[PDB]
RNA sequence: AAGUCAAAGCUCGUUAAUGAGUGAUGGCGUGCCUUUUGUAGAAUGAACCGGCGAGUUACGAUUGCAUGCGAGGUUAAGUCG
RNA sequence: AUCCGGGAGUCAGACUGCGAGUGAUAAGAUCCGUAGUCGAAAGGGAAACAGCCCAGACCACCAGCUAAGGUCCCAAAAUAU
RNA sequence: GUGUAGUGGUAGGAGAGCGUUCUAAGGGCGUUGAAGGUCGAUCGUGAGGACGGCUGGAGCGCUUAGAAGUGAGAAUGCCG
């Protein structure tokens, strides 16, 4: 034992940010977002305390898919029954249920335990153009990342 | 105050009136001790320094000579037939600090 | 000359047990399984005593990442400039400074910015 | 003249020629150094252990 | 030389070798004999020559 | 494979010393023995606790250590005890 | 390194560069020559992995430099020129 | 003192030690509580050793040497 800063539970203060997704490839937007959420960029990082922030994503319809993957990046599922493999979707979810897109392409790039789940419910993604959360005064981030 | 010191192979942050544990020193219980090397002088006017800020010392006295608790290291190899057994009590000399940089 | 086996064994076994207080079931009242558990615990203790020294470097590194990057200094170029301007702070102290004494950390970042600028 | 010789590798997995050339000079552990004169035989040993040892020409 | 202070001539009495008492002596589990083979049963070994 | 390293909180207060109990959460991690080129093996043995349970002795032979005499050493059977 | 003497285990090997045989210039095949490692070797890389690449743990520390391999996120480091 | 150097390892060879019962001499403890049992946050590099609290109620330590029915987790072991 010696002296190294170990964040407690409540001392950490979270903020609110608003990020656009207008003409950005899916990968990199998700990457920046996922890095912000886990609590990095805060020198008070602690690898078992949830020091994250709250992210709000706008215009989830105008997200960009480079080349093909408009009609080739085939998602999947399986219903745990014989012959249940339902590959239903494609890069069509941009149209419909556009929340589903980022809510997988990020719920992948996180850890896989409770911390990596309670660190996921801080996500709020809106295909539209304006959020209802003005009750909490979110700010804006930029992307040259 | 606020200062940084090289002892053993490590650094430490030092403040007036608080003790500090370090490695053995070859000095007796209750004599003065001076550390040569400083790397920073903090507080409210940071004196950053090229290695070993020139002309900065740290007094302080020694109060005890005592070892730690045992760190048993028994090794064994499975499917074969072997154990080695060990023991250890590392000695560390507690040091009370007074009169940071003069 | 018949040497009986009076109490040479219980000393040994009950010395093993006490070394296994609080194991998740019948691994604290079975003189056969307590021993195997103690053995594996010894292996793990040894290995991880060599990992306690690994992590804290990766941890201080991530913290220097977070704090430094805010000043436009990537976590490489900061260390590079520092080891170029002949400044030799130890990572642990750099992490501590980055967390607490923001003014001093920014002073160092300024000196480094000046350093590799040459 | 003289030569400074330093081990810069490991011998694990390299044959006796390399091992028994090294041992003959005084190279036991990594980054151990030995200073030797420059005959026309020492340079031969160095040419046979080039890849395992870097050398300054003092 | 008194009864309660006896000392033997130094280097004049060895100790013994009791074989098969635990893997630290170096002679447990096959009693310094190795693996199978009729040199390793009870009373193995062939006649002389 | 059920732990160890890291650790918030909660309750304590000892052979008095860098204290004890528990433990949210993170990192890492495929028992023990035997036989085998090779083991977590889906090769083979143990239900658990306790007790007993395996290189010894007599007579020869040989080499090292030591001790008493040394061109010498040395008794056996047997008698008194 | 040689010589004299006291005490043994070993005689079922495996894969991988290389050069040859039988095979069908097939086999994690079989049988030899030669080098390493495994057997008797833990730590890093190859997602996990005896035999591949790097390297041989007496012990302690919440210090520093590098090899193989790497530098968007899981996961430490360049969204480098 | 101080320098130099080395310290993975199965079959196996070598060396030094811990512990149990008994015998011999010397010196000791014990109803003002011995052996044995339980608990404790203690000591040595190891095997291991002390100290204190409770139970228990008649014999046991320590030093030097000697002799061994002297050390157990596995035998589809044997007895409860």
Q: DSSP string of B58-91? A: B--EE---EE-------EE-TTS--EE------E
Nearest to B76 by CA among A75, C47, C74: C47
Chains that touch E (3 or more CB pairs under 8 A): B
Nucleotide nearest to A38 (CA to C1'): G73
> How far from C81 is each of B51, B88, C98, CA to CA, in Å?
14, 41, 17
Q: Which residue has the tokens 């997200």?
A: A63
Angle (nearest 5°) at CA A135 between A129 and A137 = 75
Q: Do B13 and C96 touch (CB under 8 A)?
A: yes
Give SS3 for B49.
coil
- C56 in contact with chain B, both atoms CB, cutoff 8 A: no
Give B-chain residues touching E23 at CB under 8 angstroms. 81-83
Annotate A44-106 with DSSP letters as a single string: T--TTS----EEEEE-TTS-B--SS-SSS-------SSTT-------TTTTTS-HHHHHHHHT
Nucleotide nearest to C58 (CA to C1'): G76
Tell me how many domains chain C contains. Answer: 1
Nearest to E23 by CA among C36, B77, C18, C40: B77
Q: How far is the CA of D57 from the C1' of G45 (A)?
A: 35
For residue D21, what are the domain limits? 1-58
Give CA–CA dist B25/C94, Å, rounded. 26
Give CA–CA dist A67/D20, Å, rounded. 60
- Quick check: C71 and C106 in contact, CB under 8 A? yes
Instruction: Return the number of other C-beta atoms located less than 10 Å from residue C64's C-beta.
Output: 22
Sheet (strand A16-20) strand order: A123-125, A54-58, A16-20, A139-140
Structure tokens at A68: 């093909």
- A144 in contact with chain C, both atoms CB, cutoff 8 A: no
Positive or negative torsion for Cα B18, B23, B25, B30: positive
Angle (nearest 5°) at CA A77 between A74 and A80 = 155
Residue C51 neighbours by CB under 8 Å, 6+ apart: none
Give CA–CA dist B27/B65, Å, rounded. 10
Q: Which 8-state DSSP code applies to residue D51?
A: G
Tell me how many domains chain D contains. Answer: 1
Structure tokens at C40: 């594996």
Give CA–CA dist A47/C80, Å, rounded. 26
D53-56 and D2-7: which strand pairing? antiparallel
Angle (nearest 5°) at CA C73 between B14 and C59 = 55
φ, ψ dihedrals at B93, nearest 5°:
-100, 110
User: Which string of b and e fits A31-59 if b means at least 16 CB within 10 Å?
Assistant: ebbbebbbbbebbbbbeebbbbbbbbbbb
Resolution (A): 3.5
- Quick check: A38 and A119 in contact, CB under 8 A? yes
- Quick check: C28 and C20 in contact, CB under 8 A? yes
Q: Which residue has the tokens 């886990």?
A: A38
Chains that touch C (3 or more CB pairs under 8 A): A, B
How many CA atoms within 13 Å lie on the side-chain side of C54? Answer: 5
For residue C6, what are the domain limits? 1-118
Experimental method: cryo-EM
Q: How far is the CA of B102 from the C1' of F19 (A)?
A: 37
Give CA–CA dist A36/A23, Å, rounded. 20
Give CA–CA dist C91/C59, Å, rounded. 10
């Amino acid at each position: 034992m010696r002296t190294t800063y170990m964040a407690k539970a409540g001392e950490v203060e979270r903020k609110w940010y608003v990020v656009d997704a207008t003409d950005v490839p899916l990968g990199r937007l998700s990457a920046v977002v996922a890095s912000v959420l886990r609590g990095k960029n805060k020198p008070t990082f602690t690898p078992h305390v949830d020091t994250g922030d709250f992210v709000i994503v706008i215009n989830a319809d105008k997200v960009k898919l480079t080349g093909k993957k408009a009609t080739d990046k085939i998602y999947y599922r399986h219903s745990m029954y014989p012959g249940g493999l339902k590959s239903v979707t494609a890069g069509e979810l941009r149209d419909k249920n556009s929340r589903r897109l980022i809510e997988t392409s990020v719920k992948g790039m996180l850890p896989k335990n409770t911390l990596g789940r309670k660190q996921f419910t801080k996500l709020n993604v809106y295909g539209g153009a304006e959020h209802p959360h003005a009750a909490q005064q979110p700010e804006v981030l930029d992307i040259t990342n | 105050m606020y200062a940084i010191i090289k002892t053993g192979g490590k650094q430490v942050k030092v403040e007036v009136g608080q003790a500090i544990y370090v490695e053995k020193l070859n000095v007796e219980a209750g004599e003065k001790v001076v550390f040569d090397e400083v790397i920073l002088v903090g507080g409210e006017s940071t004196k950053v320094g090229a290695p070993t800020v020139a002309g900065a010392t740290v007094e302080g006295t020694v109060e005890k000579h005592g070892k730690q608790k045992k760190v048993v290291t028994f090794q064994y190899k499975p499917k074969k037939h072997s154990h080695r057994k060990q023991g250890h009590r590392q000695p560390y000399t507690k040091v009370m600090i007074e009169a940071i940089n003069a | 000359a018949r040497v009986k086996g009076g109490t040479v064994t219980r000393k040994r076994r009950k010395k093993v047990l006490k070394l296994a207080k609080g194991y998740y079931g019948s691994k604290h009242t079975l003189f056969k399984s307590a021993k195997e558990q103690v053995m594996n615990s010894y292996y793990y203790a040894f290995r991880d005593r060599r990992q306690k020294k690994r992590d804290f470097r990766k941890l201080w590194i991530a913290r220097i990442n977070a704090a430094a990057r805010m000043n436009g200094l990537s976590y490489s170029k900061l260390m590079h400039g520092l080891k170029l301007a002949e400044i030799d702070i130890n990572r642990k102290m750099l992490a501590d400074l980055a967390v607490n004494d923001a003014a001093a950390f920014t002073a160092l970042a300024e000196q480094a910015k000046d350093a590799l600028s040459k | 003249a003289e030569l400074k010789i330093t081990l810069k590798r490991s011998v694990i997995g390299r044959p006796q020629n390399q091992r028994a050339t090294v041992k003959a000079l005084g190279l036991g552990k990594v980054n151990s150094t030995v200073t030797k004169p420059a005959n026309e035989a020492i340079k031969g040993m160095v040419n046979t252990i080039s890849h395992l040892v870097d050398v300054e020409e003092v | 030389m008194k009864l309660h202070e006896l000392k033997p001539a130094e280097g004049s009495r060895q100790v013994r070798n009791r074989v098969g008492r635990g893997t630290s002596s170096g002679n447990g589990k096959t009693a310094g004999r190795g693996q199978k083979g009729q040199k390793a049963r009870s009373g193995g070994g062939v006649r002389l020559g």
